[PDB]
Write a protein that binds this ligand. Sequence first.
Ligand SMILES: [Cl-]
Ligand SMILES: [Cl-]
Ligand SMILES: [Cl-]
Ligand SMILES: [Cl-]
Ligand SMILES: [Cl-]
Ligand SMILES: [Cl-]
Lengths: 464, 464, 488, 488
Amino acid sequence: PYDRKRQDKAPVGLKNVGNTCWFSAVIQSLFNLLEFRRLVLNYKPPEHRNLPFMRELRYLFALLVGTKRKYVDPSRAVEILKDAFDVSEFTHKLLDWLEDAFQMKAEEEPKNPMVELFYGRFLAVGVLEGKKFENTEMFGQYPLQVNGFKDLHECLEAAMIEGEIEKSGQEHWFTELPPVLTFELSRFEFNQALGRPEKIHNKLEFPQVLYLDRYMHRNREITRIKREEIKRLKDYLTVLQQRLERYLSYGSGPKRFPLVDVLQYALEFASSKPVCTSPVDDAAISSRSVIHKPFTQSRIPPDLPMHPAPRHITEEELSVLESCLHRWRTEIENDTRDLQESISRIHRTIELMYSDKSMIQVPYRLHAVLVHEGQANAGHYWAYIFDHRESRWMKYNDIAVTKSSWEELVRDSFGGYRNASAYCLMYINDKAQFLIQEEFNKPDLRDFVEEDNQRFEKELEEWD
Amino acid sequence: PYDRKRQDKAPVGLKNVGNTCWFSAVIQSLFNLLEFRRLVLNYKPPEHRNLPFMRELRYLFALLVGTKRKYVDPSRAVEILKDAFDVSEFTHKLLDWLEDAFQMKAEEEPKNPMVELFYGRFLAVGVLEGKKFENTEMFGQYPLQVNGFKDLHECLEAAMIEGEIEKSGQEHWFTELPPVLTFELSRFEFNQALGRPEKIHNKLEFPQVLYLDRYMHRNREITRIKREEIKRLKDYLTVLQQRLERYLSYGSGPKRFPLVDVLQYALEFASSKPVCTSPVDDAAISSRSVIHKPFTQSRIPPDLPMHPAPRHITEEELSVLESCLHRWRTEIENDTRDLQESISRIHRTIELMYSDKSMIQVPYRLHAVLVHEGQANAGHYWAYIFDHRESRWMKYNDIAVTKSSWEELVRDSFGGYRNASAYCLMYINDKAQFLIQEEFNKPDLRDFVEEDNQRFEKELEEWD
Amino acid sequence: GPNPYDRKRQDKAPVGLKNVGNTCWFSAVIQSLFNLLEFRRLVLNYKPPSNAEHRNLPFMRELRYLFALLVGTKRKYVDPSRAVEILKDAFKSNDSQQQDVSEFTHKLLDWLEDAFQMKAEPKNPMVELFYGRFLAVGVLEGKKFENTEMFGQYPLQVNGFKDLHECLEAAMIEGEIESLHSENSGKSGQEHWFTELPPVLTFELSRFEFNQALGRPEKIHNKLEFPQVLYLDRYMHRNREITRIKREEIKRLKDYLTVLQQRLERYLSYGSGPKRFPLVDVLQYALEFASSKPVCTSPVDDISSRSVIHKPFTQSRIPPDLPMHPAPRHITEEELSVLESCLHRWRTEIENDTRDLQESISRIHRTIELMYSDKSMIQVPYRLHAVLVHEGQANAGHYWAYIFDHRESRWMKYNDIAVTKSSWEELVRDSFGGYRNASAYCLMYINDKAQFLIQEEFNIETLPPDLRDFVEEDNQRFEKELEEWDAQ
Amino acid sequence: GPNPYDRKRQDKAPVGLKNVGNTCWFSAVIQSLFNLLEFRRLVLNYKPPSNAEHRNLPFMRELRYLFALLVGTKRKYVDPSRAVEILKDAFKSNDSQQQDVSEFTHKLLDWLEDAFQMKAEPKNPMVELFYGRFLAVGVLEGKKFENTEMFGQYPLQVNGFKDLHECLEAAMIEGEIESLHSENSGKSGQEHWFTELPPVLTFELSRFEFNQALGRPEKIHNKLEFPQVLYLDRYMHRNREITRIKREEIKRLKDYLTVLQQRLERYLSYGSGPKRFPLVDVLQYALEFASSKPVCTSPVDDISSRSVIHKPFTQSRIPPDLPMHPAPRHITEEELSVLESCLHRWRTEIENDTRDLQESISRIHRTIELMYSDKSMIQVPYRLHAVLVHEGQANAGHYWAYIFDHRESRWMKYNDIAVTKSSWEELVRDSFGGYRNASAYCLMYINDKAQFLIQEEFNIETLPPDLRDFVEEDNQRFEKELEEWDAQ
Ligand SMILES: [Cl-]
Ligand SMILES: [Cl-]
Ligand SMILES: [Cl-]
Ligand SMILES: [Cl-]
Ligand SMILES: [Cl-]
Ligand SMILES: [Cl-]
């Protein structure tokens, strides 16, 4: 334990204090959100054990910006939180206390600067057996179910639509968006074979920049139309995928093979030299090689009749077969190509449905990804957080803070690639330049001489 | 630990004393060989630490026949053996000491009763580049390599033949067989992909009764002939298996399918209703059911043309195809059946090669099977030993001695079925009735009042 | 082919039928009927009404001829062209509904029933053999109903059923039924119970299910077994109360059977990631890793035979025990002792539980299979007489049949011109499904108490039995046909 | 088909060749030669000897006609019947050795070489284009030898080689060679080095290997890549000493590369039993088991929406944490703490080692791929001109070709009557193997320094270039052929 807890111009880690990986992830995520870091740092207090937790969190983020060491011990902050008693219940109370802390600071003087960052509003419009309704709900983290979806947009759309819109239905439309937009990616589904709920492992993609234009209430008439076009296109896309499958998995029996091979090999059989008998009736570097003329074949096998082959065939029989099976093969080959072109064409059309400039004006940039691996009410959490000034992805895994990549993030967060997959996505408004508010140069924390002491106490290294 | 170490008319187990499972297996195997049990029990001594080990082994088998408890602690016997220093080196020294103990007892008065049980003689006859040789070697455990063999006879034959007999060659022939015949089944082979030696997991079968007649020197002229017949038969067997494979894996491309399906499905295609257009041009328990006439179909699908199908066909084209592909399919179907009959016929001929009464007069009955599971110089050993008086297989696994079956033995010893496979087979001569020498009735050990004390000391059970 | 000795009946074998342009379905249905002796006698001893559809009576006559050849012709197979032509002419109309082989089979039977109906002027001897009655008792959102329906062929959906009893039960049950209205309120269910059984009992085995991936209906290829003798006791209305309680007991047992199969699966497919492995191997291999000799370094560095005597129970080719990767970098003696005790005891626990679960599952399975095995549930035996097989596309393919020769106690394969001596083993490969591209579409069972159905007429008579010996004329023709060939 | 507008050449595209009864091999070899401009000029400007095999000179003349149509005919494809008939007549003898398409191709080229040989009376302009020389230096059980062999097509065995360079190197190396006799004693080896390269360089890609399971020779279907430009610098005799040292360096690197691939495999396929799993999962899942809430009992008992606000970073559908099987029966707090510390630290160790191994393997792979990438190893470029593809049975199947149109800088698919504008992407799917049932059997490369080979004659002339305008006569015929059809 000599000269091990020392920095090298890298972000500070956090101690595990048992199984508090969930704490590291949530905290490091918040801390890397500069405006929130400033709100916690420049916090002065004016119900619960909320205010000592806020005060202990100050000492956590102070020694995390003052660094000096490699990792900080979050023991005092975690102990207050643990004394109040799954990890979600813990995360919930944590946020409760922080919101309540900022509420007391505001109430004394109302806008809650923390609630101003994470919470937004959406409009819920629908019908219940013919009777209309319209409500504007406040939301925080928008929760998503990931079973059977290919990406985040597929996911989100399915969540902002309930029933059948026109009969009972409901549509959600964002009215007010939070500058810090968060999504839950719920992978828990009941496994009948296992007889318990388990995490689903299908790959669900998400972009580095998400355009929330289509989900906006103002774009409600436009999106509804684009949506119906995709309904029709997906319908067409199916019929083609069905027909193409009949070409690729041909046959009426239990085993199907491609039709093109069925025809090729059938013709191979017919064109084989007939056999009238039953198959049961029965360091050379010392050689003077000849010159090989171009376009020839040397190891070409002998042409003698062997089984399996027709017993007999007519010249007319062969000529009929040869003309049939060859023309039909070209027909089959051309149709598979034609079907595949059309499928990709429909796919491209769907992909670029919301690509026009009037649907690209609400950009949200991915700031953090919270990953989980393992059993449901167990496992381990780590995070991928973006270092906006350095323009680089970072892997925050208790004590270990390493320079990562988008490629690393995807393997660990999309699912299927590894036993780990993202449980939460944190997006930041690209227009919201105030969430990354670094101190001018035209380190020296808002704190009062605390990190200066823990950097001197650690400077004390004995030498025998 | 109350009333747990108590018997119920079952054999006694042995404590693990660390990782001494190998000791339990080898000992329990010897102990269940009644004549050897008698030799160790009625042992009186007249170089090494061999004689105290023999004396400690007496106290082991005494408390193992006197039972009283569930399992015995082999700590004192194992400690002498361990003080002399892989498990084979340990097993070797163990046997060394026992042989030396019996040698001293004999030498004082020469036949070694232990060496008289396990060791035999075979004749080694051969040629070395034209020059003949003939040696009669003494053997103990005959070691076998199991890579690429289906059963014990395949295994043994490959070991009693080296090179090319008539050039250099060698043949082994048993001259003197030990009443207690043991085989090593070596599964260690260098894995190139892994870069180290590892146990091979192919299934290698062995019988409950093995006839050693063919390997006998007296039957050398006869066996040599039978052997050449099998060479010719296996040769024929190959050519057929090759031709049959051409029927079952038809095609010239990377993906092969059965020829019969290639013809069936090709005809299915031809007989489909032609389509001139391209595939891109585009709780009901309230019903009054009608009577269904016999031999009819209700859910029968509509007969409308669909892709894939010929664009066009001639009535003459179809008639040619229909006659070709149908007759050739029958031809193919009949040939696969013909080939399969012949293959099974050759297989049966090979199976019954050494079945005649003159090759069934040297029976050896399986008495014990020593199983291993896990890493090479690690893992764990247990044994399957036959209880000849009860006529039942028993699983001897440290402390745990359970009534097993042949079915259990096979799953654990043949390989492939489980991660465990037999490393050793102990066979006993069926004519040798003296290896199962039970005391007359027309328990009361040869020992002097020892088990009577450990049965009284254990009777001491406190009750608070 | 053209040579008449090729089409000469080798005596002691049944007569085949020509294909006449995809009429394999006709061969199967006809040969099935023909091999049902009582029906063969009804068609043979048929005389039409005194003073008399314009197609049913000529078809019956043409089929009288067909049947007459099948008994005593000297030829190998026989040409069903004139019988098929009358039947095919009924669909010569372009503005029809849909013309599949079932529509053809239906009309065929229509005409035969109508022919026997006209003769009955009353009992219709055909309708007496094939049709029965079942009772349909149920609820429709609380409201009760009770109907006794006449049936012919009882149609079954093959689905994912393992056998005929599984298949039949699923078809005779729907929801839940009870004595009292409250015990039924806000529920829909239905139960079928046989009241009258036909001596000739037929089942349709429907394998057509819409394939979403392919976008069309396709035959399902799962294996569905059927016995040589079927006991219809449990499906009897009189056995209703006993079957209800046994049905309820199996409900309870299957419930238990699930929970076990679920727990066992958690042992066999352990893990939280996408790839699951058996728990026992997870523990074994974890311990293998811990017990490996530690390696403190990283696995990266870049840029004739005279054999000695072998003592029993030893190992010769045993590999060297030197440290290699992968291994722990370091471990404590106490760490290893904890791991060794944990992972070993837990492995035994896991091994014992998998064995315990598997015993219990088989035990429940045996209990379920012997539910209807007692003496009071084996008094309605129906013996399998015929199996109609199909292979290939829907609306296409080919049909053939497996029919039992009751007198010589042997299964026979009826495939058009070709009538070959088969086996039960052959029948199963071709009819159960999965084994081959072919599977039975229809099963014909005969009441074991209904002897007469397949018994010969007393003297035992098997010689030409009808007065119109047109068969002698046809045999005389073929005999002179053989002569002409040798005399060329 | 019969209509002459069907067989009308749509101008700006090359002319095809009729199939004449399985002569696809002829089309491929001919179209390949024809698209080699200098050779096209040699055949076109051919005049036979003044005073003069009885089959070679008529074949050359018949091929002169064939080539003349291919340049300026108005028809879509052309009938090679008269040229093929002379060639086929040379094998009309029943008592021959063996007649495969290679024997035919060989005779074809024989006759052409012999034709040009007679004209040379000396340089044979054909032999000057296709044949080269390599040096064969080696030992035969210690005894040295040195031969300079003339070669034409250099034959390659595809085996399990990944690309053409792997393929070629394996063919130009055998054992080990050295300067001193002692360093060679009791060894056999051989090295080939190109001394003279032909401007038209051809390779055979032999995929025929005896299949033991099938009991006959069969084409191998592994993917073997080849570049659009090949640098033959390393195989040059002058580059011998540099290549030797680089060859030796790759030997050392491949050695290292193995040890790593072996160790990595032990991590990815961990276990002692028949089924191996990744070590990382073995540790993860073992820890999952240990951390599960213990269960002391056996797993056997026998016989619109108004949503609430969700706080960020929380989980809603999170399942209940209640004890279930499989789990430890019991565990100690100390037992768990030992396991948790072990299995977690070892997992990080395992994860870091797999990453470390994979980095090093890719690093060695990159080093090997850039071995011959420097400026002194890229001065002998050969550009791919043609690819001859085969599909199907050996001694059967069908041949077609991919030939490059150097003036319009585009790949073309020559398949008999059909000459279509292709791509490199098309070529790869059909020639690399594995992608389709077809794979290239021959590669034709042209020296990039040898411009003339595929350059047009200066004025740029592309109009009929030979005095015998029999082509005008044939065009006149076809034009009146079109007229006759419209006038019927
Ligand atoms: Cl469209
Ligand atoms: Cl093609
Ligand atoms: Cl033979
Ligand atoms: Cl068939
Ligand atoms: Cl009969
Ligand atoms: Cl050109």
